[PDB]
Design a protein around this motif. Sequence first.
Motif, mmCIF file in Angstrom:
data_model
loop_
_atom_site.group_PDB
_atom_site.id
_atom_site.type_symbol
_atom_site.label_atom_id
_atom_site.label_comp_id
_atom_site.label_asym_id
_atom_site.label_seq_id
_atom_site.Cartn_x
_atom_site.Cartn_y
_atom_site.Cartn_z
ATOM 1 N N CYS A 129 -9.953 0.727 6.477
ATOM 2 C CA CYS A 129 -10.154 1.488 5.062
ATOM 3 C C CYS A 129 -11.622 1.203 4.490
ATOM 4 O O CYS A 129 -12.162 0.202 4.660
ATOM 5 N N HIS A 132 -6.857 9.652 6.246
ATOM 6 C CA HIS A 132 -6.698 9.920 5.021
ATOM 7 C C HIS A 132 -8.101 10.078 4.232
ATOM 8 O O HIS A 132 -8.921 9.038 4.793
ATOM 9 N N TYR A 162 -10.364 10.759 0.397
ATOM 10 C CA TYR A 162 -10.440 11.256 -1.133
ATOM 11 C C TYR A 162 -11.732 11.282 -1.457
ATOM 12 O O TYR A 162 -12.389 10.179 -1.530
ATOM 13 N N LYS A 206 -9.394 6.249 5.108
ATOM 14 C CA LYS A 206 -8.739 5.465 6.077
ATOM 15 C C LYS A 206 -8.669 6.108 7.450
ATOM 16 O O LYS A 206 -8.506 7.029 7.722
ATOM 17 N N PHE A 249 -3.728 4.810 -3.105
ATOM 18 C CA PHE A 249 -3.483 6.025 -2.512
ATOM 19 C C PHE A 249 -2.149 5.683 -1.547
ATOM 20 O O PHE A 249 -2.232 5.440 -0.599
ATOM 21 N N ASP A 283 0.310 7.686 -0.772
ATOM 22 C CA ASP A 283 0.471 8.571 0.364
ATOM 23 C C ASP A 283 -0.369 8.433 1.428
ATOM 24 O O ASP A 283 0.173 8.293 2.767
ATOM 25 N N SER A 284 -1.211 7.591 1.734
ATOM 26 C CA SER A 284 -1.841 6.865 2.920
ATOM 27 C C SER A 284 -1.242 5.622 3.530
ATOM 28 O O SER A 284 -1.384 5.522 4.839
ATOM 29 N N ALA A 300 1.010 7.343 6.489
ATOM 30 C CA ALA A 300 0.131 8.289 7.224
ATOM 31 C C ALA A 300 -0.113 7.599 8.589
ATOM 32 O O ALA A 300 -0.991 6.780 8.551
#
Length: 111
Positions: free
Chosen positions: A8, A45, A47, A60, A98, A100-101, A104
């Motif tokens: 990341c 991911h 953003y 990421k 994050f 949600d990452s 994923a």
Amino acid sequence: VQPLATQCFQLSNMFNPQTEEEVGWDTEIKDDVIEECNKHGGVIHIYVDKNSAQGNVYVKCPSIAAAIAAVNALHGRWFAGKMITAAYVPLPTYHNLFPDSMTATQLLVPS
């Protein structure tokens, strides 16, 4: 010392919200960074923090090797006399920001 690579990273100086003038600019950055990553090791991911005074984008990648390749493609370009710089972010920090990452695992490879 310099921090170790992780999956990341944070890019800086990608934009300046005070001077951006194209409608849709932040999505254009997102899509461009995905396209660039897909010339290297991909991306899971992303953003674009469109409010960031420092021009931050968060990414990421699927592995550390993929992150290094993306960082090395993007850092060292110059926008408006400022250099795009990268900093690796620890996984727990990235996942807190994050959530949600966290789960994923499949690559963002446009159909």
